[PDB]
Write a protein that binds this ligand. Sequence first.
Ligand SMILES: CCCCCCCC/C=C/CCCCCCCC(=O)O[C@@H](COC(=O)CCCCCCCCCCCCCCC)COP(=O)([O-])OCC[N+](C)(C)C
Ligand SMILES: CCCCCCCC/C=C/CCCCCCCC(=O)O[C@@H](COC(=O)CCCCCCCCCCCCCCC)COP(=O)([O-])OCC[N+](C)(C)C
Ligand SMILES: CCCCCCCC/C=C/CCCCCCCC(=O)O[C@@H](COC(=O)CCCCCCCCCCCCCCC)COP(=O)([O-])OCC[N+](C)(C)C
Ligand SMILES: CCCCCCCC/C=C/CCCCCCCC(=O)O[C@@H](COC(=O)CCCCCCCCCCCCCCC)COP(=O)([O-])OCC[N+](C)(C)C
Ligand SMILES: CCCCCCCC/C=C\CCCCCCCC(=O)O[C@@H](COC(=O)CCCCCCCCCCCCCCC)COP(=O)([O-])OCC[N+](C)(C)C
Ligand SMILES: CCCCCCCC/C=C\CCCCCCCC(=O)O[C@@H](COC(=O)CCCCCCCCCCCCCCC)COP(=O)([O-])OCC[N+](C)(C)C
Ligand SMILES: CCCCCCCC/C=C\CCCCCCCC(=O)O[C@@H](COC(=O)CCCCCCCCCCCCCCC)COP(=O)([O-])OCC[N+](C)(C)C
Ligand SMILES: CCCCCCCC/C=C\CCCCCCCC(=O)O[C@@H](COC(=O)CCCCCCCCCCCCCCC)COP(=O)([O-])OCC[N+](C)(C)C
Ligand SMILES: CCCCCCCC/C=C\CCCCCCCC(=O)O[C@@H](COC(=O)CCCCCCCCCCCCCCC)COP(=O)([O-])OCC[N+](C)(C)C
Ligand SMILES: CCCCCCCC/C=C\CCCCCCCC(=O)O[C@@H](COC(=O)CCCCCCCCCCCCCCC)COP(=O)([O-])OCC[N+](C)(C)C
Ligand SMILES: CCCCCCCC/C=C\CCCCCCCC(=O)O[C@@H](COC(=O)CCCCCCCCCCCCCCC)COP(=O)([O-])OCC[N+](C)(C)C
Ligand SMILES: CCCCCCCC/C=C\CCCCCCCC(=O)O[C@@H](COC(=O)CCCCCCCCCCCCCCC)COP(=O)([O-])OCC[N+](C)(C)C
Lengths: 168, 82, 1105, 41
Amino acid sequence: LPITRKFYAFYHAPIVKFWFNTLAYLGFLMLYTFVVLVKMEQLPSVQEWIVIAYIFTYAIEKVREVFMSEAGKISQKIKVWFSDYFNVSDTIAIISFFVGFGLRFGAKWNYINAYDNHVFVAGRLIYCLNIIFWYVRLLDFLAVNQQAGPYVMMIGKMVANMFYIVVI
Amino acid sequence: VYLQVKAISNIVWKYQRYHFIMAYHEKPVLPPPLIILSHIVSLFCCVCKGPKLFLTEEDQKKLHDFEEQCVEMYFDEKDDKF
Amino acid sequence: QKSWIESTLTKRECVYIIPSSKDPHRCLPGCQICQQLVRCFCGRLVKQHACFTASLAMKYSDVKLGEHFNQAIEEWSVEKHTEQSPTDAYGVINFQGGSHSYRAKYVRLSYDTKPEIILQLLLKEWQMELPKLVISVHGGMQKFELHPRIKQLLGKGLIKAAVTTGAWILTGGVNTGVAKHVGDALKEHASRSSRKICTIGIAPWGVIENRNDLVGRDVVAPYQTLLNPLSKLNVLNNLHSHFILVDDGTVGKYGAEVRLRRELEKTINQQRIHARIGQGVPVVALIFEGGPNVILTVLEYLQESPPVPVVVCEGTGRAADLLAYIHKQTEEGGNLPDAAEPDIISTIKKTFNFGQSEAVHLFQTMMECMKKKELITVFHIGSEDHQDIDVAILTALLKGTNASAFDQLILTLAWDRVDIAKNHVFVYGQQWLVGSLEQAMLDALVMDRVSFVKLLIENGVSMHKFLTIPRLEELYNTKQGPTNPMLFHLIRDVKQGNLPPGYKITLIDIGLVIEYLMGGTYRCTYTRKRFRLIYNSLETKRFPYPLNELLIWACLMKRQVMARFLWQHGEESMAKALVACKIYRSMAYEAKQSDLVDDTSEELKQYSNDFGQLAVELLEQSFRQDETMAMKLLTYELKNWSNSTCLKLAVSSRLRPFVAHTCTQMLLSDMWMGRLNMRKNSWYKVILSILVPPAILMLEYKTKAEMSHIPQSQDAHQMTMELPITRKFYAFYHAPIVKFWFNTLAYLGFLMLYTFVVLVKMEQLPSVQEWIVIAYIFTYAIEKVREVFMSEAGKISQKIKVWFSDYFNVSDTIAIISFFVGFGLRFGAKWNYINAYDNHVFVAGRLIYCLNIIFWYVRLLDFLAVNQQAGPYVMMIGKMVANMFYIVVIMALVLLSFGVPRKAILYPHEEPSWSLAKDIVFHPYWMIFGEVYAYEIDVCANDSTLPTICGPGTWLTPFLQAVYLFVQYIIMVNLLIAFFNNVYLQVKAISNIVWKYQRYHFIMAYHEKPVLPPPLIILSHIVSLFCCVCKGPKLFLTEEDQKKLHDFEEQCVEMYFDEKDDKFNSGSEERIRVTFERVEQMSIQIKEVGDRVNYIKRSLQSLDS
Amino acid sequence: NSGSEERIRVTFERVEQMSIQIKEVGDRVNYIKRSLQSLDS
Ligand SMILES: CCCCCCCC/C=C/CCCCCCCC(=O)O[C@@H](COC(=O)CCCCCCCCCCCCCCC)COP(=O)([O-])OCC[N+](C)(C)C
Ligand SMILES: CCCCCCCC/C=C/CCCCCCCC(=O)O[C@@H](COC(=O)CCCCCCCCCCCCCCC)COP(=O)([O-])OCC[N+](C)(C)C
Ligand SMILES: CCCCCCCC/C=C/CCCCCCCC(=O)O[C@@H](COC(=O)CCCCCCCCCCCCCCC)COP(=O)([O-])OCC[N+](C)(C)C
Ligand SMILES: CCCCCCCC/C=C/CCCCCCCC(=O)O[C@@H](COC(=O)CCCCCCCCCCCCCCC)COP(=O)([O-])OCC[N+](C)(C)C
Ligand SMILES: CCCCCCCC/C=C\CCCCCCCC(=O)O[C@@H](COC(=O)CCCCCCCCCCCCCCC)COP(=O)([O-])OCC[N+](C)(C)C
Ligand SMILES: CCCCCCCC/C=C\CCCCCCCC(=O)O[C@@H](COC(=O)CCCCCCCCCCCCCCC)COP(=O)([O-])OCC[N+](C)(C)C
Ligand SMILES: CCCCCCCC/C=C\CCCCCCCC(=O)O[C@@H](COC(=O)CCCCCCCCCCCCCCC)COP(=O)([O-])OCC[N+](C)(C)C
Ligand SMILES: CCCCCCCC/C=C\CCCCCCCC(=O)O[C@@H](COC(=O)CCCCCCCCCCCCCCC)COP(=O)([O-])OCC[N+](C)(C)C
Ligand SMILES: CCCCCCCC/C=C\CCCCCCCC(=O)O[C@@H](COC(=O)CCCCCCCCCCCCCCC)COP(=O)([O-])OCC[N+](C)(C)C
Ligand SMILES: CCCCCCCC/C=C\CCCCCCCC(=O)O[C@@H](COC(=O)CCCCCCCCCCCCCCC)COP(=O)([O-])OCC[N+](C)(C)C
Ligand SMILES: CCCCCCCC/C=C\CCCCCCCC(=O)O[C@@H](COC(=O)CCCCCCCCCCCCCCC)COP(=O)([O-])OCC[N+](C)(C)C
Ligand SMILES: CCCCCCCC/C=C\CCCCCCCC(=O)O[C@@H](COC(=O)CCCCCCCCCCCCCCC)COP(=O)([O-])OCC[N+](C)(C)C
């Protein structure tokens, strides 16, 4: 097999696209964990810019997934994609992040002490809560294993079945 | 309830492994930071220019035989057991 | 042309047009009705020709101006006047029937085709396998329907002799009479012989309907089953799978393919039935309900090189029945009684009116036939006369060639028909040649014909005289049967990689493979010096135990059914079952460790696990018979299997059900005791007698006769010849039970000291405890080095890789290496004299001790795992840690999903610090264990212990922690309870077996150990080095006890096979099914005795007359 | 006695004995139908 053919065989394999996305996603959380645990100044740090860029482009991808999906009726493609658990979480996670960035970046810094501006606080506290969506999304990557994945689906089938015991 | 939710979850897991694997044939090659290049390149070639099983005509013949031969063995072995 | 056919085969087009009778039918104008009517002496009218020589000729008159001189009318012969041209009809017809689209392969060839060409088409193009038999059916047409029973029998028998002998039933094709009954017979016994019987109808292109439809080069051409309401024409029949559509002229003329059928009845005769068999493919003729020209055709067969015999089916029809009676009423090989012509010619007359002009002319075609009775056969239907025609047909080709029984046998061997060999070839009076059954055996072994290998042994073939070196070399170097293609990949991997093209495998090369697949110190009979000499020189070339050399052959060639045959034959059954388990297990590992399209490992591991179960089921058989001798069956040296041991072979294959069998576990229990009877002693007294030496001489030992089934050391066996005092101490201290408790007390005393050194102040120099402690670990390490050297396979790397596979032996190296780092830092460090722990080399040394000790408590689980109850729980713990892994990874993610939002909301003003990696993980982990941090929740409350953390957004954290614990405690901890409850029983069953299995390696390690524990062991080490530069257990039987044991082995294998059938036969599934089959046979007979009595009650009023 | 294991096994053993006899009464009647053309003499 020639050389340039041998690269086209690697990068276009679904196994490679996976691990090439996991490392970007794990590197993404390591950065977004860092931005959320460390002091957040007036302007976003280089981490937080790398982090916004991911979520922005990650959202362009989801839009592209919905268009290039299946049955040409726009409403059908919609109703299919919003039936998976994590794809609902992705929209809340994407929408919530750009509210928080709008409030974070769109806010008059006080210069005496941060967190006297409640637009700024509200922006950060959305980040600190939006990140929960992005750890739980690792269960979608871990659900690629033959042993792990059935436990992940199982958790939810049990939460639904224990409901009435928990109401008592 | 463990055993029966574990049996359902193994099947729902195996079933959703189609939609997952087949979604990673359509995805670009670059992950979501650098994906935008792949997006732009796919818009360039949109205003400038899924997987299928290719058989030669003799392999289609050998396959339709295999289909027929296995249906025969199915009905034959169903009565031979009954 | 993209078809071998078109370049090769042709058609026939009647280029030349000739008059008919010359009468224009009626209707005065004659010139044009000549065009309307005149069937060419071809047989199709002038315009049906369409020929190019005859297309632009009708304008003038046609071919042949005017009368053409009556002589020359008698000149159309297709040869001069009909042209060979490219085929135009070859494809696949399709029949319209219930769920079967029955296919075929029509060809449309000229009758002039060379007979070589035909057989080629049949074999390569149509991809047919050369048959082991050809049943050419010849009979009469439109023979309405046979009687119900006689149709059943000719419908089961033809199918049974064609499905078992892979035969080509050559036919006529026309759906009338013969092909009509052949086809219905196929349909009544189809789908068991569907893709096994190939039925070639050789039909003419004359009497053929939808003739124009079959035309079409390379097509899936259609075809019907609606018999044309008006027509004398004939339709091809449903179930014929192939068609030879000969063409010379047109419709009618149903006599131009007869010669071509004869060609294919010849060209198959010149092919060899099998690559090893010299006999030609047989050909037989089957007559049922014939015709006037059958008895002519019958005559032709029995007068050729060689005489194609004939099997006639009386009771069906006219010619058969005629031919039935005549040859039946014949002299032994000749003429008749006082002239029988009056009845014969009268009998011939009623079938066919001939009338003494040619009714005599039949008597000549009817004499040479019956004169050849030896070649003629007849199936007397309704008289159990060779049990449908399958016996009779196949029999016909064995009795009627005056052939040697060597050839008659080999034909059955190519047919795989043992019954016809055992009932007609091995019959009384048969006289064989010196080594002819041997040549049959060699062919049966190569061809993988187990049922003939059985027969040839049962009659007289001795495998001791049979099996030689140059022969048993052949058996490896064959491609004429089921082969293991990996045997070359193995013989490559041992002979450095180089295999020349020929490379006739040698037994020495097979010995090298058996050493590599059996591993360790195994030395085969083929790699020895005594064989490499006799071998390269070439009773001596005959092996002493031949059925042990072929068991390996059948296994290396992946021939299980032959392996499961040759195993019952001979002795050392349980040994061979555990070898085979080992050969297939290693063959399987090297198949998975290689690149290949067919993995052939689930096949081999199943083959391994099939013999592994035979050994266990024979051990359970020996154990239920005698327990003491069954334990002896585990430890006697084999002497044909590299001085090995049936137990050692099972441990070599990780065949846990055999080592976990109660017999081995009870022998293992008795080797643990030693010479001590721990049934009339207690562990209190063993410990007491270790601490009080003279209490060794007050406890109960075992006699020499309670130690005969136990493998011993030589020195131990030399002290069973005499018990004196110094002998009584040698029996105590060398018992594995005593070496254990003598090591536990040193190890428990070791931890008590090392616990003391680690809890108490550690001064500049080590205390007397810490010196005693270092000494142990130092000498304990010397022991582990000695364990690795004196272990097993001489390859240093193997001994390494085995010892580092046990859990605790990995821990021992970390524990030993870590201790002498800590001692090097502890002892190698400048004491400060102001206060210790200002020197960080010294601290680091102590903190390694304080952590190294964890290795040494956990090592007590290795001592506690000696108990039958405790040990399976210890192995179980680890099997569960591995299985709970992914639940705990989810629990670690819910942890970080909570600790990162919490630390971020409660500590917003943090610069980057390593304390951020603790605080996201610390409190959320201690929450899993019931610490709620109650007064840190709601940091803005009045009872809060973190009142300074109160700020914007901190009201979120109690909501977050409420979700957190609900997930961790109410879902995830209880999911893990649910996990354990539903996996408990099966991990507990595995752990009991893995426990019982590893009790071999443990007990057998305490035979090799010195007598002194790891502090004082160094004496035993030194003494063992002194006697190394100055100077395991075996089962000793006397020669009469070896005799009594080989008997016990034989007797228990017999009881195993006997009791296996006695259970199978005495089962309701077997008793319902043979009852089922008898009630069938009876019912048939009851409606036949019921018929006869209906032919008796008619004979009450006839006798009344 | 009133169990299927016992009723299959004695049925099994009777069908054996019968079948033997049915191929012996079947033999005798084959030695009777020969005695239709002999008595005919
Ligand atoms: C599957 C895929 C799904 C896709 C889902 C995607 C959904 C995306 C959803 C998006 C929702 C976005 C909501 C943002 C909220 C803004 C409010 C705000 O901050 O107001 C403040 C800033 O007001 C300003 O005008 C700031 C202007 C400078 C900053 C630029 C804003 C960037 C917006 C981001 C663009 C996001 C890009 C989105 C890309 C996707 C006002 O507060 P103040 O200034 O303190 O007081 C003003 C009053 N005064 C005048 C009296 C003083
Ligand atoms: C299955 C079986 C497997 C077997 C596995 C066995 C594996 C065994 C593995 C062994 C690894 C051993 C690693 C030890 C680390 C030593 C480093 C150290 O302490 O350095 C210090 C002492 O430096 C000295 O030179 C001290 C010399 C006196 C003490 C003697 C050391 C004894 C080593 C024990 C021999 C162990 C015997 C092993 C027997 C087996 C340096 O620090 P300092 O002095 O405070 O400062 C110096 C700085 N200055 C120069 C500027 C002043
Ligand atoms: C198969 C099993 C393998 C393990 C797998 C799991 C990986 C485990 C990895 C865990 C990460 C821990 C990283 C430590 C961060 C640096 C620590 C440090 O700098 O000093 C601290 C170390 O001293 C201590 O006392 C704390 C040590 C951590 C204890 C962990 C307990 C929880 C277990 C968690 C288990 C759940 C894990 C969930 C998944 C991630 C001391 O305090 P500080 O403030 O940090 O620094 C000093 C400053 N000061 C003097 C002012 C105080
Ligand atoms: C069953 C029992 C419930 C009854 C039903 C009715 C609901 C009742 C609720 C009603 C909400 C209104 C209460 C606000 C009171 C005034 C503001 C105030 O004091 O805020 C306080 C906090 O609280 C907050 O800041 C807001 C809390 C909102 C979440 C409440 C739960 C929502 C419903 C359920 C959600 C579950 C999920 C929903 C899906 C199912 C501020 O006080 P602090 O925190 O001590 O800090 C002050 C000091 N500082 C200035 C330094 C910071
Ligand atoms: C979108 C796709 C992302 C994919 C990744 C690619 C992008 C990543 C590449 C580059 C981005 C990083 C830019 C760094 C800029 C400098 C920052 C700075 O000033 O100092 C910081 C340095 O930086 C760090 O310590 C790293 C911060 C992020 C933590 C996670 C890194 C791993 C994740 C991603 C990679 C792993 C791969 C994951 C695969 C398994 C901190 O400095 P400090 O010394 O701690 O400060 C002293 C503290 N003091 C003041 C209290 C004394
Ligand atoms: C499509 C999806 C939904 C989008 C919803 C819309 C989102 C955008 C919403 C709102 C627009 C932003 C308002 C601008 C602020 C005006 C007041 C101001 O100037 O500053 C004041 C802010 O006082 C506060 O109380 C700020 C609270 C902001 C957080 C609330 C939004 C949470 C969104 C829910 C999450 C949704 C996540 C997505 C869920 C899927 C005070 O600061 P200052 O003025 O600088 O100085 C002090 C002056 N003062 C003391 C005299 C007061
Ligand atoms: C610069 C960077 C350098 C490199 C970076 C290295 C990064 C390392 C990255 C990842 C670590 C895992 C490596 C093991 C992979 C094993 C192989 C595999 O594919 O197994 C499975 C895993 O399939 C997955 O999709 C796993 C996804 C892991 C991401 C989730 C992290 C969990 C964090 C939560 C925990 C919190 C604690 C986290 C710590 C704070 C899939 O295999 P399978 O489907 O079974 O197919 C085989 C089937 N067969 C056996 C029949 C053939
Ligand atoms: C701060 C951070 C905290 C930690 C983060 C933890 C992250 C989360 C961790 C793990 C997530 C597990 C992955 C889910 C897998 C998919 C399941 C799915 O699609 O839906 C499942 C259901 O729906 C659910 O199960 C909903 C999600 C359950 C999360 C549990 C929240 C409980 C807390 C609230 C209480 C708190 C009390 C306190 C209140 C203040 C599928 O169900 P089904 O049976 O297939 O079909 C349903 C239909 N039926 C009903 C007819 C059967
Ligand atoms: C390598 C294999 C080893 C095998 C064992 C053979 C070697 C063992 C033999 C001898 C070694 C011991 C030498 C002792 C030297 C004197 C020490 C000293 O000065 O005082 C110590 C005395 O000693 C003890 O109290 C015992 C210390 C070890 C702890 C337990 C040993 C038991 C295990 C081994 C034996 C049983 C085996 C059990 C088996 C089931 C302590 O004195 P104190 O009075 O506490 O101090 C007052 C405290 N105050 C200052 C605060 C007031
Ligand atoms: C083959 C297996 C691997 C072996 C690895 C190699 C092992 C050997 C490793 C290292 C060799 C020893 C180095 C000597 C110390 C040099 C510094 C010194 O002299 O003193 C300094 C010590 O300062 C420290 O920080 C000491 C820390 C020592 C512990 C680290 C080793 C842990 C090994 C991991 C465990 C592995 C266990 C085994 C795992 C299987 C200071 O003390 P001082 O000088 O007296 O006075 C103060 C002066 N000062 C304040 C100005 C500074
Ligand atoms: C100077 C000194 C004087 C004497 C000292 C006396 C020293 C006393 C020494 C030991 C105490 C145990 C004595 C009971 C023995 C019972 C008999 C036996 O063999 O049972 C089994 C134990 O087999 C073992 O190997 C047990 C090993 C014990 C060491 C682990 C200690 C646990 C510490 C952790 C706990 C922490 C707490 C620790 C304390 C802080 C083996 O038997 P079996 O395989 O079942 O074979 C019989 C089968 N049958 C029934 C079918 C026939
Ligand atoms: C300080 C003192 C602490 C207390 C001391 C305790 C001492 C320990 C006590 C008892 C030890 C139990 C004896 C083990 C028996 C042998 C098992 C074996 O060989 O391996 C088993 C596996 O591997 C293991 O099970 C590894 C050992 C498990 C120890 C548990 C550590 C968990 C802590 C970490 C988390 C901490 C979180 C916090 C992080 C900071 C066998 O597995 P298998 O199934 O046969 O085969 C595996 C292959 N498979 C995967 C395909 C199935």
